[PDB]
Amino acid sequence: NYRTIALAFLDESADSTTINAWVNEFAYQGFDPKRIVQLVKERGTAKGRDWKKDVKMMIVLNLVRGNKPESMMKKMSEKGAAIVTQLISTYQLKEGNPGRDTITLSRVSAAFVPWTVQALKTLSESLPVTGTTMDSIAGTTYPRCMMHPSFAGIIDLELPNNTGAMLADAHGLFMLEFSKTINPSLRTKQPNEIAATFEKPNMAAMTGRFFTRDDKKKLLIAIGVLNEDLVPNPAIEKCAEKYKAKVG
């Protein structure tokens, strides 16, 4: 009796530890940052490069020119283009969002965020959305370390007093602009529509387990998002609210 078989599941076990284990396996994953690190190191070593240096060039390039390496070269000085040509060759770079195992510039920045966050304060005016632009919209100084997507990798939701949530929201504000600026068509659309563009990939970076929760606290403090007592920059709270307003 089928009805009865189905009802029987009311008393079937629902072990939370098991369920959650399943959730981790099953969850949305653009890529595994762990692999990216591995692949970089190996591939660079294998061609005897100063790979750490290479990661740094790749990141800047990504922040300055996006995620499309071949296209990029089309409109770059011959000199830069030569440099870029090597990375693509060595690290087997690709564009957009290929498989778990593929390196892209965007991935490099996400994986290696601790640098990325540093680099950002250096080149903000050279960014596709400038630090000054963010400032107007922000209505304050918008933290430069937040001005890339990879920042989400550093966010801890489980911070007390809803600080993680605030961070994400303050980050969201940039994200909207970045996507619009990245993708022109989005500009017609409403802010809630745009958010949908990045919520899943961003949320996944936030909940990924590559970095420890303690690792995040340290980074956040180090780059000045939080003071040593876990208190956020006042600028953050402000922005989060604007983001909330723009979407709900």
Q: List the interface residues with a copy of itself, window 21-80 (CB under 8 A).
A: 22-30, 32-34, 37-38, 41, 52, 55-57, 60-61, 64-65, 72, 74-80
> Which residues does residue 104 pair with via DSSP β-bridges, in sequence order?
94
Residue closer to a copy of itself, measured from CB, 15 or 234: 15
Asked whether 78 and 2 are in contact (CB, 8 A), the reply is no
Options 70, 92, 105, 119; binder of a copy of itself; rule CB under 8 A: 119
Rule CB under 8 A: say whether 175 interacts with a copy of itself: no
Report d(CA 191, CA 176) in Å as an integer: 7
- CB nearer a copy of itself, residue 6 or residue 48: 6
Q: Which is nearer to a copy of itself, 50 or 234 (CB)?
A: 50
Closer to a copy of itself by Cβ: residue 14 or 48: 14
Give me the least distance between CB of 32 and a copy of itself, in Å please.
7
CB 110 within 8 A of CB 103: no
Closest listed residue to residue 184, CA positions, set 192, 174, 194: 194
Query: Residue 14, SS3?
Result: coil
Inter-helix orientation angle 33-46/78-91, to 10°: 110
Q: What are phi and psi of 13, to 5 degrees?
A: -65, 145
Q: Does 96 bind a copy of itself (CB under 8 A)?
A: no
C-beta closer to a copy of itself: residue 45 or 227: 45
The least CB distance from residue 70 to a copy of itself, in Å, is: 12
Residue 132: CB partners within 8 Å, gap ≥ 6? 124, 125
Q: Are 95 and 68 in contact (CB under 8 A)?
A: yes
Least Å distance, CB 37 to a copy of itself, is: 4
* Cα 149 to Cα 105: distance, rounded to the nearest angstrom: 12
Residue 169 Cβ vs a copy of itself, minimum distance, rounded to whole Å: 13
Query: In whole angstroms, what is the distance from residue 117 CA to residue 150 CA?
Result: 8
State the minimum distance, in angstroms, from the CB of residue 13 to a copy of itself.
8
Choose the stretch contacting a copy of itself; rule: CB under 8 A; options: 88-96, 109-117, 167-175, 229-237. 109-117
Q: Which of the residues 189 through 218 are near a copy of itself (CB under 8 A)? A: 190, 192-193, 196, 210-212, 215, 218
In the complex, minimum distance from the CB of residue 88 to a copy of itself, in angstroms, rounded to a whole number = 13
Spatial distance between the Cα atoms of 129 and 222, rounded to a whole number of angstroms: 24
